[PDB]
Nucleic acid binder design. Sequence first.
RNA 1: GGUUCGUGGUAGGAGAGCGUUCUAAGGGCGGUGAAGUCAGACCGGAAGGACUGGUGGAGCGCUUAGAAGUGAGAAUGCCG
RNA 2: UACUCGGGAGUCAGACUGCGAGUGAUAAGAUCCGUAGUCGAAAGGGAAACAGCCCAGACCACCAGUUAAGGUCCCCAAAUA
RNA 3: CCGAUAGUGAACCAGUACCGUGAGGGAAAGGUGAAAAGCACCCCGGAAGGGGAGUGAAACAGUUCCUGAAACCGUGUGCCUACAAGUAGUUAGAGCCCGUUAAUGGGUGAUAGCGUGCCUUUUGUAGAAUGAACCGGCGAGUUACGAUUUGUUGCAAGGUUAA
Lengths: 53, 143, 118, 112, 48, 101
Amino acid sequence: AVPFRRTSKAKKRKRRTHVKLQLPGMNECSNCGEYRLSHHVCPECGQYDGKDV
Amino acid sequence: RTTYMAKPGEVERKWYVIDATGVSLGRLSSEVASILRGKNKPQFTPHIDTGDFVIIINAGKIGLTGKKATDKIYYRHSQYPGGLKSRTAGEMRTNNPEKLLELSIKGMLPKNSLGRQLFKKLHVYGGSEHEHAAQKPEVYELR
Amino acid sequence: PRVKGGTVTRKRRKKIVKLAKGYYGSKHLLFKVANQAVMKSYQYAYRDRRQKKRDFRRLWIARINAAARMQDLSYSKLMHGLKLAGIDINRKMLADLAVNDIASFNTLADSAKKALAK
Amino acid sequence: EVTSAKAVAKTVRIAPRKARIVIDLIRGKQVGEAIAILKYTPRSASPIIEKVLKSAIANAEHNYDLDINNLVVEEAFVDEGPTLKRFRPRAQGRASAINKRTSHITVVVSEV
Amino acid sequence: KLHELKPSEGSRKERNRVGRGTGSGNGKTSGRGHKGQKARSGGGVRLG
Amino acid sequence: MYAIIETGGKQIKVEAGQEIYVEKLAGEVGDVVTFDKVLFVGGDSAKVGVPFVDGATVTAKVEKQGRAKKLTVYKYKPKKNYHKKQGHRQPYTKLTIDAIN
RNA sequence: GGUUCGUGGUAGGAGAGCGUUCUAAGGGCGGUGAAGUCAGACCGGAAGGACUGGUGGAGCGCUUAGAAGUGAGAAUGCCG
RNA sequence: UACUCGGGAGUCAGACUGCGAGUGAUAAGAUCCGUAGUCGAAAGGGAAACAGCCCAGACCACCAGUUAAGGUCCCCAAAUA
RNA sequence: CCGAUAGUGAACCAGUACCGUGAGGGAAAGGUGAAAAGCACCCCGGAAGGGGAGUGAAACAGUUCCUGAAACCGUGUGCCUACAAGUAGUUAGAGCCCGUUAAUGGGUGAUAGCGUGCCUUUUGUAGAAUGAACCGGCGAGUUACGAUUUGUUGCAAGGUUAA
Ligand SMILES: [Mg+2]
Ligand SMILES: [Mg+2]
Ligand SMILES: [Mg+2]
Ligand SMILES: [Mg+2]
Ligand SMILES: [Mg+2]
Ligand SMILES: [Mg+2]
Ligand SMILES: [Mg+2]
Ligand SMILES: [Mg+2]
Ligand SMILES: [Mg+2]
Ligand SMILES: [Mg+2]
Ligand SMILES: [Mg+2]
Ligand SMILES: [Mg+2]
Ligand SMILES: [Mg+2]
Ligand SMILES: [Mg+2]
Ligand SMILES: [Mg+2]
Ligand SMILES: [Mg+2]
Ligand SMILES: [Mg+2]
Ligand SMILES: [Mg+2]
Ligand SMILES: [Mg+2]
Ligand SMILES: [Mg+2]
Ligand SMILES: [Mg+2]
Ligand SMILES: [Mg+2]
Ligand SMILES: [Mg+2]
Ligand SMILES: [Mg+2]
Ligand SMILES: [Mg+2]
Ligand SMILES: [Mg+2]
Ligand SMILES: [Mg+2]
Ligand SMILES: [Mg+2]
Ligand SMILES: [Mg+2]
Ligand SMILES: [Mg+2]
Ligand SMILES: [Mg+2]
Ligand SMILES: [Mg+2]
Ligand SMILES: [Mg+2]
Ligand SMILES: [Mg+2]
Ligand SMILES: [Mg+2]
Ligand SMILES: [Mg+2]
Ligand SMILES: [Mg+2]
Ligand SMILES: [Mg+2]
Ligand SMILES: [Mg+2]
Ligand SMILES: [Mg+2]
Ligand SMILES: [Mg+2]
Ligand SMILES: [Mg+2]
Ligand SMILES: [Mg+2]
Ligand SMILES: [Mg+2]
Ligand SMILES: [Mg+2]
Ligand SMILES: [Mg+2]
Ligand SMILES: [Mg+2]
Ligand SMILES: [Mg+2]
Ligand SMILES: [Mg+2]
Ligand SMILES: [Mg+2]
Ligand SMILES: [Mg+2]
Ligand SMILES: [Zn+2]
């Protein structure tokens, strides 16, 4: 329940191979032509599916 | 200073066919393990593979002196509790004559990464016909 | 007068970490771990100057043997004939001829073969 | 001619380990796309890193007169800063150490 | 000649310092042996 | 055409125009050194000596007198407080081979 | 300068030395860049000593003696 | 090499192996003596590994040679003598 | 004699802060620059903080600010690495990449042989016996007065003064 040996630099770096976070699934808006998330209301032009909300 | 050291791909490696009828299992395997190693060439280099390719035919007619056909046992454990399995030399020669020859020769090769590469160089056939006619192998006579 | 311990401790310790260059992990960074890796390397290099002479003679012997068996001779019979006839060439040069100038190696093997036959 | 510009945010309260995880997304990307990534990444370091990137572009055109439409994020790294030492009273009269770490954030933009 | 003073040869010697490393022969135990009454500070018995 | 000569307690295979390193010899830079102990002469023929070829010599010129790169010989024994350090530089002689006779 | 015999080593005995701070005399270098610090493939049988280049921005070597708060990898050592 | 006089010591927990005895059960890697060796304080080669068994005592360097114990079918140098 | 872990506990608003009911215990903390000439003005930002411009010999001297080592944390890249059993090295060694205090040079290394850390205490420790997370500073035979022995110097049947 207590570490027997200290963790080296290589072993501590190998474990953090998977602690990254992925890239957002963003998309180009059809109306205002800038980035937004898919299946989401565009935060700039306030439109979804071509109709203002 | 000045002592010749071979390079990978510098030495020519040949193909051989050896007939394994009537010869003892260990007399043949000792002779073969030196051809794969390359100890018959003055270009021998310990850290380089300079040996030749060997094909063994008629492996089902290998000789077993004395009562070795029934008294010689081959063991095999599967790392499970009570998972030890055994076979006899004579029973394996009838069913798997190829495994008998590769088990004998593999123990006569160095136990490292290079000796694990010389085992990929040996082909054993229980019958009298092989499939490597494209390599044009020669006939090697035992000493 | 007071003698504070400056500028001398670091110079001596850093000279050891420099000798540990190329070692894995902390063996090339920290003094204590690098100090005992340098001492071990000196000990390994001391006795490897002795095995280096053994390693090469085994290579020459196993290489003269291979070339002698192509002339219906063994290494032991070849060595007996050469010493019996009087040739004093050592293993380093007999192995050199067996690889580079195999034509002359057969000349020496003929002298050894004749001396063993009177 | 300079062809590059940089901006630094020194002693930001966020910890270095929590900021390096967001820097790793925008490195090597175009400033137009890199701004959108920080806008749609739900982490607390996104607003901080986004002002450093926007400030780097700002003086990449006012000071050196470069094109906003050709810039890329050439370099982006996080350094360490002076930590604040605090304590947390644990059970049975003992106290434990707490590190309130800071960081330096550097972003360099340049032409492609 | 105050820059070329040379005392009579053999009249002076350099004192011995113990407990200064194992390369001088007076290192770890400083010439005392191992774990007795005579290996302790202020140790030793009466004259008689 | 090459020869095998004995010098420095060992043997070296020699060829015309070659630069070799041997144990320290006597002679200033520019002097000519002749070797009288020739064991084997090759090339377009064969002269095997018993043990020395009779009347065969090799001549060479001294190019440099010097010492090899520095070593450091170190020994220690664990738990016994024994260490020993020492440096070494092996002298040598550099020669250029002129002709084989 | 030769000849002969030697040259494993714990506790321990004997000898010769390296390096640090300060003092005295002689002789020196340094804003055309001192000490310190960083790097290097140089020198000596060891402890160790130079040289070149970057940083630094004002002190420091050498020779012969003298005097010591005299050399750390370990003390469940003290402090950061 | 011995001996005498003088300055400085450390040591007084020993281990196994062969031989000769006691205690023990003609047990013990037991215990206690006499005698020789090695380790302690001894690296190198052989007993697979293996302080005490066999050979043999490391000033340094060499890509030189002859031997000791032990070995010469392959792993692994040398006789499928 | 010391030179900021030294020298007074205290070179700085120190018997202070803090701890205890109380008697009492008791720290850490020096250095911009010759001169504040301590950054007018512009740009991003709520601000902090930056990039220019300017002062200055120097701003990589910008309000723990002379110098700025090691542990520790990062970015870029030359060589190697996903069939391999490892006290991490040493000896032999191809391939690839460089070019020095110029000399039988430098970096990395597929593969092959050999190889069970340092200290202490022990008959005997790789030891499953003890100590150390790592780096840096500090940390242990000294002095006074007497005894004895060796070396050196002066005088010598004499030598030498103490207060
Ligand atoms: Mg002082
Ligand atoms: Mg110190
Ligand atoms: Mg390496
Ligand atoms: Mg409470
Ligand atoms: Mg002395
Ligand atoms: Mg000693
Ligand atoms: Mg010690
Ligand atoms: Mg002790
Ligand atoms: Mg004692
Ligand atoms: Mg000795
Ligand atoms: Mg000896
Ligand atoms: Mg002494
Ligand atoms: Mg000084
Ligand atoms: Mg300098
Ligand atoms: Mg001290
Ligand atoms: Mg130490
Ligand atoms: Mg420490
Ligand atoms: Mg005596
Ligand atoms: Mg008694
Ligand atoms: Mg006894
Ligand atoms: Mg017994
Ligand atoms: Mg006993
Ligand atoms: Mg002992
Ligand atoms: Mg031994
Ligand atoms: Mg042994
Ligand atoms: Mg055994
Ligand atoms: Mg062994
Ligand atoms: Mg031991
Ligand atoms: Mg063999
Ligand atoms: Mg103080
Ligand atoms: Mg200071
Ligand atoms: Mg109160
Ligand atoms: Mg500003
Ligand atoms: Mg501002
Ligand atoms: Mg500016
Ligand atoms: Mg100016
Ligand atoms: Mg100043
Ligand atoms: Mg500073
Ligand atoms: Mg640093
Ligand atoms: Mg496999
Ligand atoms: Mg692979
Ligand atoms: Mg194993
Ligand atoms: Mg290896
Ligand atoms: Mg190992
Ligand atoms: Mg200990
Ligand atoms: Mg015990
Ligand atoms: Mg204890
Ligand atoms: Mg512990
Ligand atoms: Mg430590
Ligand atoms: Mg005393
Ligand atoms: Mg007198
Ligand atoms: Zn939109």
